[PDB]
Amino acid sequence: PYMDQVLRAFYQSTHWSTQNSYEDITATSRTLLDFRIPSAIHLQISNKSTPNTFNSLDFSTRSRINGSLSYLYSDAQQLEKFMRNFVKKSLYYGRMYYPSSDLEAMIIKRLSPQTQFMLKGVSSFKESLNVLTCYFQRDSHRNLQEWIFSTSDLLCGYRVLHNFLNSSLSLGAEFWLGLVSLSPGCSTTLRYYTHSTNTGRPLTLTLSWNPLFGHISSTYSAKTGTNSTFCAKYDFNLYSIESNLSFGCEFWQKKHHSIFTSVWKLSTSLRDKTLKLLWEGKWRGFLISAGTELVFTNIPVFPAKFGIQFQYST
């Protein structure tokens, strides 16, 4: 999204290390595998109106001209440089989408050198839900203890991420307790950023868990190349065994003679029996993002949901 990209430029400007949190812990396993394929032809232009107000617009063949009016204010005086992929700082974000007047907001207030706070409201007029969450969190050098109070029903939560000890045998958890739904939830993660001498590469062995369902997962994610990257997730389940094996082959490039950069992607799934392809090519301001999805289950190979997506911005 763009709410989850504004969040990452505030963190890298305040040096908060979002990669040690329990929302970027299985990061490579989802950016190479569960990317979005555009389902139609698409055009988009973004701009910037006031010093603290951005504007967007898009129209596809399906939907008409949409839009959004962003607001963004922050005391972080190196913010906008990391938008493009002690002082008690702050951030205020707010965005209304206007074919439909769907709101959203975000308030960050770094209350200490090692403690934050995060409001995240999403208040849609239609499909009505005033979700209003609060993410108190106390970072340290070995933790990211992070309490969440949502307002979907009354959903409270918890997270923790204890780093151990290249060999980084990390650990995580979460313990969610719906105060109205009475439906708990848990997890565990044992990721391991390592180093090897085959190509020069990390690994990501995400030995996940969910002890209520027995829903163990896995993940392997190599970096076989100086630019390319490969991943392979093996889903599983306990007491009701039903597997999967996904894939992903994000392949980079750089071109010169503004500089053209092209990032290829694949996603071979086996339980879904599909093959997702996508090419994402940038420029100074322009960005073309095409993508197809072949389904293998005569003529089995039927490319459902082709799409291209143009985007210019500034």
């Binding site: 109106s49 967007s56 001209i65 009016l69």
Partner: protein, 348 residues
């Protein structure tokens, strides 16, 4: 020179809309009158879009010809239950610390009116008045707008008055005269308390040979809303056929406003103000003979409302969150008690 950009409309009823606007400053060979053309595309309504050409050409140091070719489609009256489309041209000539300008236009427009509400939503937009306004019309209109704005700012002022006077003559069909006063006055040190008064009157005559050719629903006056008399729904005042606001042939609309700059000191010196207002007005159909019996109607039973609230006043927009209370109303007016959200540029 080109500046293909994107913005936000801040239009009629609280609901902003995206536009995409390509400019082109024409070079000094098809020129010696410094001309820029525009092409602004907006979201139409569900079949069509809204294209809006412009061609501003500075004739004199104080003269600008605008040639505006529009093809715009938009939703309208209360439940977005009316679909309006407009095709035509507009040749407009604008003549120049107090802002003063006169602006004469000449517009030919073909207007399609569609009842786009569903027949399950049963008596709304399906009155005898709205059933007969659906159709197609062509309409040439001549105008003159005079604006004398002695205020120091347009959206967040602190002194001075404003006078806007409009005329519209569709020849042999209707003549439409509007006035809008405004008066902003401040009494404290750093413009802390700002007392703002507005008065809008209007009058519309049917010039069409013994009351043939009715005036269209899009040409009559409407009252109510966040950007008008607050504490009533938009299209919420005036006479009605069944449940549809059929507009008025004359109106008066006033309003007070006090602002207070939020006495919490860490949030002072900002664009937020503590807002208290008293709005009100009357919308009437005036038995189209005189100007004397029209004021006997226009000053009899007003639809007033008071309320407190909090307002942001930026140069690009004015956000208004009020708690309104209808003081008086008519028995069929649309009331909107409690919280009301306002957004736009012009409030009254």
């Amino acid at each position: 020179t080109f500046t293909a950009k994107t913005g936000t409309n801040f239009g009629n009823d609280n609901d902003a809309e995206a536009y995409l606007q390509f400019e082109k400053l024409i070079d000094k060979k098809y020129l010696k009158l410094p001309t820029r053309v525009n092409l602004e595309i907006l979201r139409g309504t569900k079949i069509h879009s809204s294209f809006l050409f412009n061609s501003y050409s500075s004739l004199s140091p104080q003269s600008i010809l605008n040639l505006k070719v529009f093809s715009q489609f938009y939703n309208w009256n209360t439940n977005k239950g009316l679909d309006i489309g407009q095709r035509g041209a507009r040749l407009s000539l604008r003549y120049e610390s107090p802002t003063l300008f006169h602006e004469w236009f000449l517009e030919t427009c073909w207007r399609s009116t569609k009842i786009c509400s569903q027949g399950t939503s049963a008596p709304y937009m399906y009155s005898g008045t709205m059933l007969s306004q659906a159709g197609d019309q062509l309409r040439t209109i001549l105008g003159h707008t005079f604006v004398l704005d002695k205020r120091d700012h347009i959206m967040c002022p602190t002194k001075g008055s404003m006078l806007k006077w409009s005329n519209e003559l569709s020849p042999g069909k209707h003549l439409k005269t509007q006035l809008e006063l405004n008066s902003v006055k401040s009494w404290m040190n750093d413009d802390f308390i700002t007392f703002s008064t507005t008065i809008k009157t209007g009058y519309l005559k049917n010039l069409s040979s013994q009351q043939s050719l009715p005036v269209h629903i899009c040409d009559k006056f409407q009252s109510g809303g966040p950007s008008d008399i607050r504490g009533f729904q938009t299209f919420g005042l005036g006479p009605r056929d069944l449940y549809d606001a059929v507009g008025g042939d004359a109106f008066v609309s006033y309003g007070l406003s006090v602002f207070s700059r939020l006495p919490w000191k860490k949030v002072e010196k900002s664009n937020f103000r503590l807002h208290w207002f008293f709005n009100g007005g009357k919308l009437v159909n005036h038995d189209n003979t005189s100007l004397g019996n029209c004021i006997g109607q226009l000053s009899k039973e007003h639809s007033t409302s008071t309320g407190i609230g909090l307002v942001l006043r930026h140069p690009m927009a004015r956000f208004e969150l009020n708690f309104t209370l209808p003081i008086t109303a008519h028995e069929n007016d649309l009331i909107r008690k409690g919280f009301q959200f306002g957004l736009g540029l012009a409030f009254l």
